[PDB]
Amino acid sequence: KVVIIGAGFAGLVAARELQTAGIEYEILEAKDRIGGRAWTEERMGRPLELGATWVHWFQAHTWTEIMRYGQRTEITASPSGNDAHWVTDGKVVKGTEDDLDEKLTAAMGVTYEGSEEYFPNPHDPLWVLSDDFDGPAEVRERFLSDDQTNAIDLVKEAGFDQETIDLVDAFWCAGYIGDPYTGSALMAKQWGALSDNRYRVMEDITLKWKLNNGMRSLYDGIAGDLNTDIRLNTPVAKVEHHATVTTESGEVIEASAVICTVPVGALSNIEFSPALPDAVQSVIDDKWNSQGAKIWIKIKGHHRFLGYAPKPAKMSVVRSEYFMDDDTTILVGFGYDNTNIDLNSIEDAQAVINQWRDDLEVVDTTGHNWVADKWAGQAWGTLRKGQFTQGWSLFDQLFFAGSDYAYGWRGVCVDGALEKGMTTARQVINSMR
Numbered sequence: 001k002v003v004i005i006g007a008g009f010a011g012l013v014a015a016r017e018l019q020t021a022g023i024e025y026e027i028l029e030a031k032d033r034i035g036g037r038a039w040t041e042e043r044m045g046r047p048l049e050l051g052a053t054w055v056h057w058f059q060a061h062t063w064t065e066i067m068r069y070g071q072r073t074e075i076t077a078s079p080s081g082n083d084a085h086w087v088t089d090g091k092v093v094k095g096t097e098d099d100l101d102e103k104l105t106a107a108m109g110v111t112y113e114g115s116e117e118y119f120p121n122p123h124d125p126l127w128v129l130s131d132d133f134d135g136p137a138e139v140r141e142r143f144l145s146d147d148q149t150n151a152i153d154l155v156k157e158a159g160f161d162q163e164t165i166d167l168v169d170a171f172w173c174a175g176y177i178g179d180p181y182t183g184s185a186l187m188a189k190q191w192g193a194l195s196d197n198r199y200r201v202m203e204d205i206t207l208k209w210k211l212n213n214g215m216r217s218l219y220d221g222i223a224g225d226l227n228t229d230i231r232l233n234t235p236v237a238k239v240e241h242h243a244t245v246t247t248e249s250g251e252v253i254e255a256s257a258v259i260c261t262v263p264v265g266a267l268s269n270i271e272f273s274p275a276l277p278d279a280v281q282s283v284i285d286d287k288w289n290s291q292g293a294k295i296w297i298k299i300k301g302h303h304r305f306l307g308y309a310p311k312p313a314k315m316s317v318v319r320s321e322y323f324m325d326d327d328t329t330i331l332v333g334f335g336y337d338n339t340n341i342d343l344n345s346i347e348d349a350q351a352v353i354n355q356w357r358d359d360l361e362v363v364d365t366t367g368h369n370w371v372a373d374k375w376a377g378q379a380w381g382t383l384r385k386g387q388f389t390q391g392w393s394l395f396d397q398l399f400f401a402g403s404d405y406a407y408g409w410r411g412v413c414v415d416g417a418l419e420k421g422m423t424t425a426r427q428v429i430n431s432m433r
């Protein structure tokens with residue numbers, strides 16, 4: 001009676017929540033698998049996360065699922081103390097990881113600089129624009145101005161030198177999963193607000209703890225709780241919200257309400273009748289700022305490596321992640337432009353490593369191009385200029401659920417999908433009561 005489109009974390013958790021409340025549901029999943037943009041799979045000799053990877057106990061929704069499905073102790077920190085390399089003026093600079101972090105810490109201090117006035121409650125991101133806002137006019141003006149400013153311009157304008165600029169440029173190529181110069185700096189400021197405004201905490205939350213048993217231990221857990229079979233290989237083609245849903249084969253399914261978790265980068269596969277609001281339609285057409293890609297590279301030997309490179313490098317942040325039995329290292333990498341790298345080309349993977357070193361030898365590589373993926377069309381959702389205040393909040397019988405619309409760790413984190421999936425089901429629940 002309630003139709004959930006997509007079996008990623010938002011869809012699975014919404015179904016479990018409806019089930020709790022005794023409401024009939026059905027999940028229609030385009031792919032032949034569950035997990036969506038979280039995808040644990042054996043590649044290159046071990047389970048690797050092709051999408052979502054890191055977790056933290058300060059992420060409320062993720063951490064309760066970690067507790068629920070038995071992974072409390074089953075988390076491991078990514079290697080630290082790497083030999084660090086960063087490109088800053090056509091040149092490769094060699095340092096320690098702590099050397100890099102302290103440069104990034106001071107720049108982050110400036111980047112967060114008004115989060116305390118914007119986000120007293122870091123989970124009320126649009127409070128400044130609320131009728132309830134009790135602050136001065138000049139804070140609302142700085143807020144809107146920040147939505148139209150990118151995060152690197154904030155560091156440039158504070159007088160930092162070119163070294164620190166290319167470091168933040170590389171950082172946000174990875175963080176904004178695409179071109180950071182088109183991004184909204186209010187995203188970065190809210191990550192600060194959710195991280196006690198400390199670079200170190202922000203990295204502990206987003207870039208440290210991995211699930212020993214992968215994301216699949218969680219989404220297999222949620223799916224294992226459901227008493228209604230997920231209909232895989234059932235891509236949705238049309239949605240009528242007056243609700244009626246039409247699959248690609250032409251099957252028609254009737255429903256009291258529709259919870260659509262299809263990411264924006266993939267909504268163009270579905271026709272809506274009536275059409276979507278013009279405001280929301282312009283977001284879909286502009287979509288999100290996530291055009292980048294994530295790679296897994298394997299090299300010869302055991303090397304503790306960290307590398308940073310600004311736009312337009314193939315990869316902006318690359319880091320050792322696993323030391324393997326056969327004297328190899330698996331590194332992870334994040335880059336701003338999915339179309340500048342073939343994630344499964346040993347030669348393109350070598351050119352990534354060649355950004356910093358001419359003595360490290362790639363022997364394998366792999367990745368999934370989420371942006372080119374029909375059912376995704378993006379990496380993790382990040383914000384263009386103007387999308388903090390006129391973007392993710394515009395998607396509020398038809399409900400949109402997904403990390404990209406979350407109040408808290410929006411887009412970038414499974415925490416956001418688990419948040420928004422659950423609260424969107426509550427909207428359904430509340431209105432049926």
Ligand SMILES: Cc1cc2nc3c(=O)[nH]c(=O)nc-3n(C[C@H](O)[C@H](O)[C@H](O)COP(=O)(O)OP(=O)(O)OC[C@H]3O[C@@H](n4cnc5c(N)ncnc54)[C@H](O)[C@@H]3O)c2cc1C
Nearest residue numbers: 006008010030036037051052053054236379402403413414
């Ligand atoms: C490279 C990468 C790395 C990430 N790393 C992390 C990390 O370390 N930590 C973290 O917390 N988060 C991370 N994330 C983010 C996390 O994966 C997402 O925020 C979360 O999985 C989004 O869940 P969702 O349910 O909102 O969307 P999705 O996972 O995209 O779920 C949508 C589902 O709908 C399906 N679908 C699409 N179109 C249709 C259609 N027409 N009909 C039917 N079904 C359809 C899709 O197949 C998919 O199963 C990462 C994301 C990426 C891309």
Ligand SMILES: NCCc1ccc(O)c(O)c1
Nearest residue numbers: 171174175203206207412
């Ligand atoms: N994949 C985790 C998302 C992410 C990307 C870049 C960062 O700089 C960061 O702190 C977190």
